[model samples]
Each structure stands twice: as structure tokens, then as C-alpha cells.
Target: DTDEKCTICLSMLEDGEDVRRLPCAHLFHQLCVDQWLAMSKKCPICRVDIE
Candidate 1:
């Protein structure tokens, strides 16, 4: 029932994980945040720039 994907790696969201839903309405796996942010500071799907 998930409709979210990581913009950086284009991976789907898994169940029972602590998902981070950004202010942009974008969702991501917390485990993916470090690598994702290291590359870019933005919501992967919406490209909503972040700090």
C-alpha cells in the first residue's frame, strides 16, 4: 500500500520501517538518508530542495 520511492536510488518503500516524510510530501527510508543527502540536499522524488 506504499506509493513512495527514493528519488536517489529509485527504490520502493518497505513496511515496518521508520519512514521520513519530508515537508514536500516525499517519503524515504531513514537508512537511505545519509547516502541520499551526501549526494544532494533535496527531496528525491519532488526535487524539493532541503537543508
Candidate 2:
């Protein structure tokens, strides 16, 4: 397991849990990513536009 934290919420990226793998290859919590994307439409960390 990666144990990579969700950069969005600064929380631990749990295994086999709610998550989202961005086209940019970034990772995030499912709810966290969606909420931000709904308002921003990009990875908050690297600002990679997933278009």
C-alpha cells in the first residue's frame, strides 16, 4: 500500500477506500476531490487541469 496522504485534506490515504485517481496521476479522497473539482475543476495541489 502506498500510504500516501490525500493532499486535499492532509489525511492518510487508506487502502481500499473512497479515493480518486486523477488523470494527472495524482491521488485524493473521493469526497475531497469531488468537492474541490466541482468548484475548481483541477487538482488543488499541482493545479493539473484534468481536461
Candidate 3:
């Protein structure tokens, strides 16, 4: 449940390329993560507070 989850949209990580890895070492779906990063830099998962 928790371990296989992506916190951004609470979805499971897709099988391949649609995923992105952040400097904080969290993984998210590219569309979701990119949309958020375009607004501000942060780890959507743990809120690591990026620049």
C-alpha cells in the first residue's frame, strides 16, 4: 500500500517513463511532479522543501 504509492496524486507508480525522480529521492508521475515543480520546487511526497 504505502511503499508502492506515489504521494502526489495517491496513485501507483506507472510501469515506465511517466515517472520522475527528485533530488530528495522521491518518485512521482512526470505530469504531476512537473506541474508542481513549475509552480515551486519541493518534493511532493515528503515536502522536503526544495529550492
Candidate 4:
């Protein structure tokens, strides 16, 4: 039961949705985060290094 939203896609995260958490405490869909991280290893929101 996560009320968090995937800021990457700007969509609500439903229950059981695959999610990923960054070291900066930001959360996103696993696929979204993976793609984002592949290009940039920084948190999209805070610009913190996610490595």
C-alpha cells in the first residue's frame, strides 16, 4: 500500500507496482528509474548522485 507517485512518469503508484528507491530517498517506477539512471546516475528530483 504505497501512496507514493512515480515522478518520472507523473503517475500514481498502485499496489504491487514495481518501484525503485534512489539513495536520495526518491522513488520511481523500476523501469522508469532504470532508464533514467542508465542515462544519468543522479536523482531526477534532487540531482543527488544515485551511484
Candidate 5:
């Protein structure tokens, strides 16, 4: 289901929310993920290197 929580912010992702999808198939809020990607280009959940 699309009902998932962002691991970084610990917030629930509602339907139609702006989200960033990782190559690992994980999802997070766009702003939250963007901020995180600025420091680390790895998936927060899998730690997979983002290209």
C-alpha cells in the first residue's frame, strides 16, 4: 500500500502527498528527502548508494 511513514521525519505519508521515491523503492517526503540527500546520497532505509 501507499500508506507508509517517512523514516527520517517519522511522519505518515498520506495519499497524493509530495514524496521522493528512492531506487530502493522506499519513499519519503520530498523536502525531508531532499534535505537528507544534500548531506548523504544514500537511501535512509536501505543505505543504498543513490546515483
Candidate 6:
């Protein structure tokens, strides 16, 4: 099961809105992560490197 309604916007989701699953497997918005990854390519929780 999923954790929360995605940590990006914290809004309700519909199909295809999708998530950007990192190696750490946390909930992130696929649509909005374009900026977040550019800002920080690390898991917001575990601080793992995405590179």
C-alpha cells in the first residue's frame, strides 16, 4: 500500500499523476519533481544520493 497522497503537493491523486520513486522508495510527485531533483537529487528523508 502507499503511504501518503504523495509528498509533492499533498493533494489527492488520480491515475497517471504518478510518483517519482527514488532508490529509497519514498513518495514524490513525478509531475513536480522536475524542480525538486534539480534543486536536490537526494532523498528528502534518507538523504541518499540519486546519482
Q: Which stretch of 10 consecutive residues in model 2 shows the poorest summed lDDT? A: 8-17
Q: Of 4 and 6, which scores higher on TM-score? A: 4
Of candidates 5 and 4, the better by TM-score: 5
- Stretches > 4 Å off in candidate 2: none
lDDT of 5 at 4: 70
lDDT of 4 by residue, 18-47 (tens): 888888888888888899999998998899
For model 3, the run of ten residues with the poorest summed lDDT: 1-10
Candidate 3 on 1-51: residue-level lDDT in tens?
Answer: 244666677767764538888888888888878989998877876788666
lDDT per residue, candidate 5, 1-51, as tens digits? 755778778778664558889898888888888899999989998999888
lDDT of candidate 1 over 26-51, digit per residue (tens): 77777676568678888777788876
Q: Kindly report which residue pairs in candidate 4 clash with one another.
A: none
TM-score against truth, every candidate = 0.60, 0.81, 0.70, 0.80, 0.81, 0.64
Error of 6 at 36 (Å): 0.3
Off by over 4 Å in 6: 1-3, 13-16
What's the lDDT for residue 24 in model 2?
A: 87
Clashes in predicted model 4: 0
lDDT of 1: 0.70
Sort by TM-score, best first.
5, 2, 4, 3, 6, 1
Stretches of candidate 3 above 4 Å error? 1-3, 15-17, 49-51
Local error of candidate 2 at residue 8 (angstroms): 1.3
lDDT of each: 0.70, 0.83, 0.77, 0.84, 0.83, 0.70
Candidate 2 Cα RMSD (Å): 1.5
